Design a protein around this ligand. Structure first.
Ligand SMILES: Cc1cc2nc3c(=O)[nH]c(=O)nc-3n(C[C@H](O)[C@H](O)[C@H](O)COP(=O)(O)OP(=O)(O)OC[C@H]3O[C@@H](n4cnc5c(N)ncnc54)[C@H](O)[C@@H]3O)c2cc1C
Ligand SMILES: Cc1cc2nc3c(=O)[nH]c(=O)nc-3n(C[C@H](O)[C@H](O)[C@H](O)COP(=O)(O)OP(=O)(O)OC[C@H]3O[C@@H](n4cnc5c(N)ncnc54)[C@H](O)[C@@H]3O)c2cc1C
Ligand SMILES: *SCCNC(=O)CCNC(=O)[C@H](O)C(C)(C)COP(=O)(O)OP(=O)(O)OC[C@H]1O[C@@H](n2cnc3c(N)ncnc32)[C@H](O)[C@@H]1OP(=O)(O)O
Ligand SMILES: *SCCNC(=O)CCNC(=O)[C@H](O)C(C)(C)COP(=O)(O)OP(=O)(O)OC[C@H]1O[C@@H](n2cnc3c(N)ncnc32)[C@H](O)[C@@H]1OP(=O)(O)O
Ligand SMILES: [Cl-]
Ligand SMILES: [Cl-]
Ligand SMILES: [Cl-]
Ligand SMILES: [Cl-]
Ligand SMILES: [Cl-]
Ligand SMILES: [Cl-]
Ligand SMILES: [Mg+2]
Ligand SMILES: [Mg+2]
Lengths: 437, 437
């Protein structure tokens, strides 16, 4: 079938590539409104930090290379401006010529993702981060203005990564956030080490703080404070890229996202939606879920490829919401329902704090593992881990446990890989099980 | 009930402690033939390397302290020499006085473990490593003789750990092994990094090599080579400590181990066996399994405690054989049936080598993950991982998968925790699933 994809990055380029694996005959075209396809979204903070020097690392493909290797046509600087779903075409604006045309499809795959929110100030020193163009712009501005003092707005995991990278690059960031709910996917009390790490490096932060006014480099804050900053990076949330979809028959939710079934189909025949734009449900509980992360974009890309060109009995089973961020010396990982969603269950909490590995083995550090379970059926609802070592390992194991609706009690049976550098004969995970009675 | 335990270490002392958690009234006595109870078996190589220098990490308790804390009586230098099961007593030799006596029991728990094999040479410079007495003897010999050149015999995980530790201590070890089958718990073609790490540090080794003759410090080898060594550490396997059991009605297998049911019961009423001495079955396949490692000793200890003084519905579900060793910069981990046992199945192998984390992200290292599955039911039979980073994480996740009867194909559904320092949007585990078929 003739395949049209909207968006040429984590969901879109991946999905097109996965289709080509199964189908070498069908014509596949991707439209991308911006300059670059297949940029490494998750690499961008590290590019800013000069942790990733080789820009070859930030871009996986050019349209020419993508066609040479995969025979997939990608048109950059081409923005889909409408979906004419009944005639099965899309309206495309060629941004270089400002001329529009229609492209027909047999199957349409929407992976337009999300755009950065802006505070809306009239300021030449303020930047958001979403693609490689933005990264280039930030880097250029730092060099052109010899930026030192930088205001980082927002305490979400990406903004935190940006802050760390600015610090390591040698700049002097200050963090502000409009509330005290930093790194919001993690349990609030377990986020303390973020503040500790800031304090340790004398990186200033202010929570429940906001920009009031901007006058050149002079920033006035809600608190009444006035500070001079060379640059501002705003990480104040994102919004779905769905304005071009509203005139079509596709059903959007009140927030502008696209609900999909387990085949990643929209309500309209022959149109799929994947990635950040799509909403689904949890795997382990009967609740809606939105998990705008890379794993889900890649998984959906594969499922849609099977739907279109492979085994059409392959369907999504829902999200667990596994997520993770590194901040300086610490790892913060969680999986399952969000903190605010626990209230929809009758639940209990079990936790342990123990060395990541054998206490006598050097380089040890305390790992805090927390598990919530449903009192009606003993099933694990949520797990969270914070520490310098071992948090990703425990949370990945628990993700696998939840995938199978494992109970908290059965954690006593988990057979860990033990040698002194790695764990304990009764691992932290085992101890959760022993302590659950 | 009056409880007698044989062996006061990983299985025995742990089990006694777990019983006391549940039962404060029963008399509990442990007989230990050697000097120390509760020594840290797994720490011993690191004590030798002077990595672990605090004595308090080398053993947890003296009998006096154990009694003060838990009211459990432990008699060291007391060797059980016979089990008189028809009269419900054991015969015990007080090794200090050289007098024997009978001790009655209502329940008997056997955790005698295994002893190190010896090459049988008459050599004052040769040592084996099994307990803290051995560790002290090795340390003292090194200092008393200004040991520099050490011959390490055997290439199993214990020997490898001892070699690394002798090197870090500043000594000069040479490794020999009778064959090329080093680190046998790992796939034979995945062990090359062991040899690479030896070469990189110019630590000599010879495979297909054996001690032929010893004359003082002059060692003559199978290869015909003649070398002088200050010390020899022999790691040439272990044998079950079961000779004292043979005259009793307890059923032993032909290799000298004790088969037990899922309650860790022997064939004889009121007698349990746990730890290295015990044989059971795999959890995921219908085959016999023996896994002489700490996790199993500890899990069996808990189950036996529940059987005697707690919830007797709690039963073992079998072994997976999860195991791991560090050697210099590398980790070698595996789980499931042994390579030699794969032939009992119709199976296929799938593998991937990929960076442990995001390719553009620094400090990366290639991680090799291999998975064997049963073609009859797509179930996972064995997994193995080798790399500087991430191998323990992948194998623990796969251990949890096998616990849950996951098919290889369902690995595509594993929701990993992804950010650049930790993994990929399609993790190695996911790629195993995609590559299967
Ligand atoms: C700085 C940063 C760090 C991140 N770090 C992590 C992380 O550590 N872990 C994690 O799991 N996730 C991380 N993410 C999230 C991640 O990148 C997304 O979940 C993923 O990219 C979603 O895939 P997508 O295809 O939905 O959106 P994208 O990858 O953002 O691709 C959407 C594309 O569609 C294009 N587009 C939109 N509308 C149109 C149109 N009308 N016509 C043509 N093209 C259009 C856009 O320009 C864009 O290029 C990070 C994101 C950012 C920005
Ligand atoms: C150097 C070394 C490193 C190791 N590293 C690891 C590792 O990294 N990971 C891992 O999972 N495992 C490791 N192990 C394995 C581990 O220690 C065993 O699996 C565990 O100790 C088994 O517990 P057990 O109670 O069966 O035997 P043990 O812990 O060895 O205790 C058995 C005790 O019974 C006593 N005994 C025997 N017969 C009698 C008798 N007739 N009367 C009285 N007492 C008796 C013995 O003297 C001994 O003290 C290591 C072992 C060694 C020696
Ligand atoms: S923010 C974090 C996530 N963001 C993004 O992913 C950024 C943009 N991503 C993309 O544009 C695509 O994901 C690109 C980079 C184009 C890759 O697309 P694919 O996921 O489809 O992978 P490739 O085709 O480039 O192949 C790479 C290696 O993986 C193997 N492989 C992919 N898919 C499969 C399946 N379904 N089954 C078996 N193997 C598969 C490839 O064969 C290949 O192996 P190599 O030995 O490296 O060639
Ligand atoms: S070779 C690898 C393993 N090494 C060996 O096992 C060496 C020999 N080990 C032993 O001799 C025993 O294991 C000793 C050290 C004597 C004690 O065994 P336990 O496993 O029972 O540990 P403790 O009794 O000293 O208790 C310590 C902490 O763990 C908590 N805890 C133990 N058991 C449970 C259960 N069943 N349920 C909930 N919690 C449990 C304790 O409460 C305790 O916590 P603290 O921080 O000390 O208050
Ligand atoms: Cl990326
Ligand atoms: Cl239309
Ligand atoms: Cl729907
Ligand atoms: Cl230990
Ligand atoms: Cl008898
Ligand atoms: Cl590969
Ligand atoms: Mg007799
Ligand atoms: Mg490769």
């Amino acid at each position: 079938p003739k395949i049209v994809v909207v968006g040429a990055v984590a969901g879109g380029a991946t999905c097109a590539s996965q289709i080509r694996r199964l189908d070498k005959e069908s014509d596949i075209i991707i439209f991308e409104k911006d300059r670059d396809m297949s940029f490494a979204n998750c690499a961008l903070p590290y590019v800013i930090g000069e942790v990733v020097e080789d820009r070859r690392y930030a871009l996986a493909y050019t349209p020419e290379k993508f066609y040479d290797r995969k025979q997939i046509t990608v048109k950059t600087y081409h923005e889909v401006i409408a979906i004419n779903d009944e005639r099965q075409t899309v309206s495309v604006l060629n941004r270089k010529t400002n001329e529009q045309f229609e492209e027909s499809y047999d199957k349409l795959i929407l992976s337009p993702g999300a755009s950065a929110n802006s505070l809306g100030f009239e300021s030449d020193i303020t930047f958001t981060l979403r693609n490689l163009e933005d990264t280039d712009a930030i880097d250029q501005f730092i060099k052109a203005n010899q930026v030192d003092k930088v205001l980082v707005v927002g305490a979400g995991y990406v903004s935190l990564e940006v802050l760390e990278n600015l610090y390591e690059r040698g700049l002097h960031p200050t963090l502000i956030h409009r509330s005290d709910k930093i790194n919001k996917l993690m349990d609030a009390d377990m986020n303390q080490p973020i503040l500790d790490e800031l304090d340790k490096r004398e990186i200033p932060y202010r929570l429940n703080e906001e920009i009031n006014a901007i006058n050149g480099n002079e920033i006035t804050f809600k608190s009444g404070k006035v500070e001079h900053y060379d640059m501002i990076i705003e990480g104040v949330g994102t919004h779905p890229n769905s304005k071009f979809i509203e005139s079509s028959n596709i059903k959007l939710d009140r927030k502008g996202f696209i609900p999909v079934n387990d085949k990643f189909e929209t309500n309209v025949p022959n149109i799929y939606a994947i990635g950040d734009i799509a909403t689904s449900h949890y795997r382990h509980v009967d609740l809606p879920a939105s998990v705008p992360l890379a794993w889900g974009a890649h998984r959906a890309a594969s499922i849609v490829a099977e739907q279109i060109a492979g085994n059409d009995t392959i369907e999504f089973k829902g999200f667990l919401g596994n997520n993770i961020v590194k901040f300086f010396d610490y790892t913060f990982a969680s999986v399952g329902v969000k903190p605010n969603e626990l209230k929809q269950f009758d639940y209990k909490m079990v936790e342990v704090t123990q060395g990541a590995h054998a206490n006598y083995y050097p380089g040890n550090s305390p790992l805090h593992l927390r598990v919530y379970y449903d009192t009606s059926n003993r099933q694990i609802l949520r797990a969270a881990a914070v520490g310098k070592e071992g948090a990703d390992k425990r949370i990945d194991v628990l993700s696998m446990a939840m995938m199978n609706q494992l109970t908290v009690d059965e954690l006593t049976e988990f057979e860990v890989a033990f040698a002194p550098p790695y764990s304990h004969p009764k691992d932290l995970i085992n101890m959760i099980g022993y302590k659950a009675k």
